Amino acid sequence: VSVSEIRKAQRAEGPATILAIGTANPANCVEQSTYPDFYFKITNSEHKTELKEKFQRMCDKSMIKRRYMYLTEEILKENPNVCEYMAPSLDARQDMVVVEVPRLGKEAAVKAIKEWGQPKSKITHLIVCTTSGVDMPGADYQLTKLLGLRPYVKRYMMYQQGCFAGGTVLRLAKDLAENNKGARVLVVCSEVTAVTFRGPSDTHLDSLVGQALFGDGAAALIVGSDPVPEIEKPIFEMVWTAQTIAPDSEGAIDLHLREAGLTFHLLKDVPGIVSKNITKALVEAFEPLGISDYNSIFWIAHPGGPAILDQVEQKLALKPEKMNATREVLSEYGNMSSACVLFILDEMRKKSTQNGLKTTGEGLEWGVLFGFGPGLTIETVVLRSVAI
Amino acid sequence: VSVSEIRKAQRAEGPATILAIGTANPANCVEQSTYPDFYFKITNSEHKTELKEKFQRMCDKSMIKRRYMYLTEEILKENPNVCEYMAPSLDARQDMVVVEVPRLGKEAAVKAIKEWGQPKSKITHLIVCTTSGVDMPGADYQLTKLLGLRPYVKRYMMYQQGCFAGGTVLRLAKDLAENNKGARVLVVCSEVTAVTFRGPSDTHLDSLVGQALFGDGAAALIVGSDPVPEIEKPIFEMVWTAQTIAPDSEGAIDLHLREAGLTFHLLKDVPGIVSKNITKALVEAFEPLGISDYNSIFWIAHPGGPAILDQVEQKLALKPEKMNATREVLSEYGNMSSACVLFILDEMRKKSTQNGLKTTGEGLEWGVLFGFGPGLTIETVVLRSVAI
């Protein structure tokens, strides 16, 4: 047997391409304007006047209009340990998210498969990504079951990943599609805040900020190299990826899975660290392509908070329109952790097509997608649009 | 800018190759002959006489002479919640393994990098895999810091994976090395039983079986395509991989992460399912290669328990020597979950080289490595040996 023959016959030829995007969110919609009143009443903290004022300002500055949440008032009233700031509550939280993560991801995945138009039996790889809960067999096994994928689908279960992982799953699917002839990767990010929700405490305002920002959602992609012309429909192409850890950012964002659920901590200035290091990330990606005008590429940035977006825009002098798709997803859905950046790609390509632009990346050729999260980690994906 | 030029210049040419292997284990060595006495005492269950006799039979049939355990008598005496069959103890368990996982992985990784002999700054990708504990930033971030890797190393944090993911990390590193010119992947699997350890209960004999089998260990690999002749030293080549879910195996092995730590459940006959499904996995892998004599290839099987090995050997009529390296690792270390198969590759190539055989695969050309675990999942990696 010749391994070099086997190897040339095994691998794909072209760039890993996004061929379909589908999204889903819990039915329960939570208005941001009145969230403070609702959250202080459900967590029994109505008597903390200075603290609720603090949360009202947080919610007012978030630039989030609404979020979708698996957690309802009814569910929360049955779980006082989840409504406390710190009470043993992981078993109850796990019981919710071990079921909700695959459920919600299945909705998003069905949508993406329908868009793609090809038999689910041609799905050869599955990436499932979440930051809410873990189990064995994982959510990857659950989604194989729920979707009726072939039992020999090759699975990649990405657990406890964090806000920066929409970039990581793309980085992964790129190598899976490109190195394997005929491979079609289903990619699912599904994030539920039932593991992080907790009551307010005036000595942990970083935990509280989280309660203003994180929302639920799943996004699914079909990724593959060598699309069949006129049968499959390219949306975006991946060209180059990177992951780095920003200097001076030790302990900026930490989340620990405990008996009281997933705690959320912010010890450094995230917006300032991201803004200070985004240029270096851009030159590593775009210098080899000869591009240095960052207003000439389309943008996708994980909206960890609005201040990240503002401080990046200001550092680079981005025109205000560059972050439009990013800010629309933040407005309608809040920070959905790893899924957010995938919703943004959907928003951008949908708006570009609806508005008659020349490419799926706002009429521009090249673009960038950034994931930001614990480490402080920056994930970079270089994208090329598709004509029409 | 041409994406096809970029794609041709970006990818590697040859098969992903294992270039170094290093292992490590906690210093505390626990003899199996006297474990029943020690465990029924540290868990305050000396009254449970019938149960303890059942354990001694489990331990005597295990074919495990010793195991290395991070947990010591001193640690167990400071953690009575850990020694109960089911007491709130995840926070204590997480505090142990969030630190011991990357500590032990770093020992293994330093050994492999020393074998490899190239500057650690040439490590471009890092896969870290564990079934014990989770945290954010992960053990991948911790090992990047502990080892001094470049902060732009591309990371793949595989958490809550199970016995079966020694195969998974090889499946993963194959695509990473093969699709990226110059990529050198450090792979670390590091497994500590402090999240599973718990007292006995005579109504849960499946959990008790876990206490007789699982041990601690880390194994590290350097994986890359296009090795530099006579600078780098190939050990094994990967040629083809697969992952499947055996029919009729729902709920065979389940592990849940709870406030009381990671529970372990066995509801089906694992040895029976693995043995009924192994032929199908071998014909998928070897039919395309023209090979059907399973005694003509070298073998690496995850030793979940000894009955898995006995029932596979019997089904296939394997000669008794085929499972030698597997059994020697089971004997000296126990089931180390995802790290186990990697120690078995290390034992086989070291014995082959020590005994003056012609290849690193016991003098044979082609081999197979199998990972077995929750799902019921079977991971298959086809390997070619290297001369000398």
Swiss-Prot record, chains A, B:
Q: Give the residues the record marks as binding CoA.
A: 54-61, 307
Give the record's keywords alphabetically.
Acyltransferase, Flavonoid biosynthesis, Transferase
Q: In which pathway does it act?
A: Secondary metabolite biosynthesis; flavonoid biosynthesis
As given in the record, the signal peptide range reads: none
Q: Name one GO biological process term.
A: flavonoid biosynthetic process
Q: What is the effect of changing residue 214 to S/W/Y?
A: Drastically reduces catalytic efficiency
Q: What is the effect of changing residue 264 to V?
A: Decreases catalytic efficiency 2-fold
The effect annotated for residue 335 to A/D/H/K/Q is: Drastically reduces catalytic efficiency
EC number in record = 2.3.1.74
- Single GO molecular function: naringenin-chalcone synthase activity
Superkingdom of the source species:
Eukaryota
Name the protein family: Belongs to the thiolase-like superfamily. Chalcone/stilbene synthases family.
Q: How does it assemble?
A: Homodimer.
Q: Which PANTHER family match?
A: CHALCONE SYNTHASE 7, HYDROXYMETHYLGLUTARYL-COA SYNTHASE
Q: What is this protein called?
A: Chalcone synthase 2
Q: Which organism is it from?
A: Medicago sativa (Alfalfa)
